[PDB]
Amino acid sequence: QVTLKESGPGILQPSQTLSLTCSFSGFSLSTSGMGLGWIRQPSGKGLEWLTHIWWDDIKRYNPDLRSRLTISKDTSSSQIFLKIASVDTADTATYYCARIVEGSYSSSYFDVWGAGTTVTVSSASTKGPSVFPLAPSSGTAALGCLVKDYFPEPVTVSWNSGALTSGVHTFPAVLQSSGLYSLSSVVTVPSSSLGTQTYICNVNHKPSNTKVDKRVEPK
């Protein structure tokens, strides 16, 4: 019945200080053999331990980042906190709060993990996407939408307002050197549909409160 819930600021600019909070129930950070700490994961990458704090206030830190990390507990409200100073784009990641425990042989394994909070570090401004058609050429046809130059993640893409789902691939976004994301969403359809069926990609970019509905037709 252990629960950990991370909260953070979502988006930051380079050189700002990231402050994260983890609220926990279902155990006391005061009982022995118990700790609480932070582990991050950049999108599509692996895991990096950052720091944890034990029930007796012993603090451990990743040495490559000790000069920027600070961890602290407040038992009085069942919470721990992480500061990461002067962030840069490399600190973009999902940040998980995780309970570390001590066993009789060994210890430093994490037996409960929170759902994570996502942090993007960027000097980019919030910006809805431009949506360009990927027009079916002239069996099976493919068409799609290039969803370009937006910030931040995520966008969602549906087709014909949710009616078209089979054959849809909405690809992971890539980060362009401009600092803006770009992604494509494609769908394969019967060629015999191209003159009669209407195809519209519905792009939702909640960070900018933007919806784009773009009809894709042969050229």
Partner: protein, 212 residues
């Protein structure tokens, strides 16, 4: 400082099969190694610690073994929900370090990529940029090779790609590449081509267009 190495980013299995994932430590870590499972969209989940001790409630088909620098993780009969990323971790000494992960994928009949090329739209060209898109659709296995050729000249450094997760219904992958040129550079050339090779392809497949 201690490097955990999982030699395979991907491993292929079939349901009910037996699969073993390995993990090599750069230094002796006694037998202080954990194993985490991470399903897409969710957070990691501890399955095994101290090399061989299972977590309460974790299904008995999961097993771990090893000592020193060599550790293994075994699934007795891969169930469909076991398709996920698996990470080892040494918990012998700070700093605690994770392996690069191993993605467990499902084997299926070879399917060649369906290739499509998309010229840039007029709407985008009016704004100053040209994005050319190559799609490689519904293929298996995951390893596929593509090349951008502009006027039969190899393009390098001006395209980004991404790949979907293995499809949950037909177990295929798809790949999307965007080549991005200035409207100026786009106009300097005639034939835009994407050329694909793959285990399912007897001979390379090329899709191309002529600008305008």
């Amino acid at each position: 400082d201690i490097v955990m190495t999982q030699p395979h980013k991907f491993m292929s299995t079939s349901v009910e099969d037996r699969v073993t994932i390995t993990c090599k430590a750069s230094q002796d870590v006694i037998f202080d190694v954990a194993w985490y499972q991470q399903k897409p969209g969710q957070s990691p989940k501890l399955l095994i610690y101290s090399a061989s001790s299972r977590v309460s409630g974790v299904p008995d088909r999961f097993t771990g073994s090893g000592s020193g620098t060599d550790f293994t993780f075994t699934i007795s009969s891969v169930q469909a929900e076991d398709l996920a990323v698996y990470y080892c971790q040494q918990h012998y000494s700070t700093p605690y370090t994770f392996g690069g992960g191993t993605t467990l994928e499902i084997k299926r009949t070879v399917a060649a990529p369906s290739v499509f090329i998309f010229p840039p739209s007029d709407e985008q060209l009016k704004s100053g940029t040209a994005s050319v898109v190559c799609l490689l659709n519904n293929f298996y296995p995951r390893e596929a090779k593509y090349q951008w050729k502009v006027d039969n000249a190899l393009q390098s450094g001006n395209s980004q790609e991404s790949v979907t997760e293995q499809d949950s219904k037909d177990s295929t992958y798809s790949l999307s590449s965007t080549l991005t040129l200035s409207k100026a550079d786009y106009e300097k050339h005639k034939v835009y081509a994407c050329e694909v090779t793959h285990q399912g392809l007897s001979s390379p497949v090329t899709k191309s267009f002529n600008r305008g």
